[PDB]
A = this chain, B = another copy of it.
């Protein structure tokens, strides 16, 4: 509907960035490697193929190993495109799609035959890719140069119109999955079956999604990296946290919702806690504006969580006292969000400039993944949370801060695990676009 024209503009922007990167490093071009198949130890099975982000940054070929871009920022980029013809393969038609006019395409039938399409004098080129020993054999002395990658990673923060469209489509697929997952939860289904419901609606399976989904019932919602999926449902399914996304052309969505089951003891109470976290998400989204330091968004999240901890009677101190004593970190221990793009935890969040000068997170907020200034064309997650994490509550109970905690109230919330409400937002010059809310993903459907 608009992708060919927007893609051609995307290519012009990438060519411009490539010219600058090449000037900084003193090179004539880059050779960008999609990757290779990875064989299991002692075995003939392979790992799922995961394309080099620097390759899919140019072209929506995400499922094809042994492909190579040769770019100089001036000429039409060369795409060496892997297309074996052995009888056991599904041989697709030669590439022909919205993107193909942008490239000089060379078909490669044998991965080991790639030298014939590469530059003769590689002294002037840098290989960009994971297979640094392969690049060495092929003759590249310059591999993954920091000046090039720091510059490209910095610019990756600013999405082109094409990229923003791809991210909108990824959000659409993810939202469909999310709505189906909520229904499956309310049907009493296991974590495993809820995940299949999400796959069925998003049309994305476990090796299509851009990160492994968190599908967590009851107390599992307190476990931030909960990776199991139980195949039997709990006797009582009272709460549900799902963190799951989708890919479109290699661009990610990254969405979290939390739910309370109708009819269980204290359902309304937990539901209202979810609603309070939701209001923090939306308030923080409104605080995103060009010029704001993203660290201030993180600190503002801690202020919101403190207000909830106070209002619910969980902590018998004033909101600023709850913050200043460090108590909010027990309940909200991770970062407020991060750049989103070709990678889920997208690149450039902890640098100050395009040369890679570090700007690390504060010491008391070590898991914050972005400290950049907010600007137009950036895409962010905003993901406040409030959890009842047994290990951190136990640590807290053994401190002097334990006397301010109403442990009866903690015990009432604890069986519901925790809460996170994560949206994906495009920052524009004069407004924000909450892709997730624009698709009518709120709190119950």
Contacts and interface: CB of A to CB of B under 8 A. Distances in A.
Interface stretch (A69-77, A108-116, A223-231, A406-414): A223-231
Contacts of A53: 41-43
Interface string A16-58: 0000000000000000000100101111110110101110000
A42 B347 contact: yes
A114 to B, nearest CB: 18
A394 B149 CA distance: 47
Interface stretch (A134-142, A195-203, A425-433): A195-203
A219 B185 CA distance: 38
Interface stretch (A82-90, A268-276, A304-312, A354-362): A82-90
Which applies to chain A's interface (DSSP): helix, strand, loop or mixed?
A: loop
A89 B205 CA distance: 24
A417 to B, nearest CB: 12
A61 interface: no
Interface residues of A, number: 53
A207 B87 CA distance: 27
6 contacts: A41-B129, A41-B130, A44-B345, A47-B48, A87-B224, A90-B227
A302 interface: no
Interface in A181-226: 192-193, 195-196, 199-200, 203, 205-207, 210-212, 220, 223-226
Interface of A: 35, 38, 40-45, 47-48, 50, 52-54, 85, 87-91, 129-130, 149, 192-193, 195-196, 199-200, 203, 205-207, 210-212, 220, 223-229, 231, 333, 343-345, 347, 389, 391-392
Given A43-B343, A47-B48, 9 more contacts: A35-B41, A40-B50, A41-B129, A41-B130, A44-B345, A89-B223, A90-B227, A192-B205, A195-B205
A266 B270 CA distance: 59
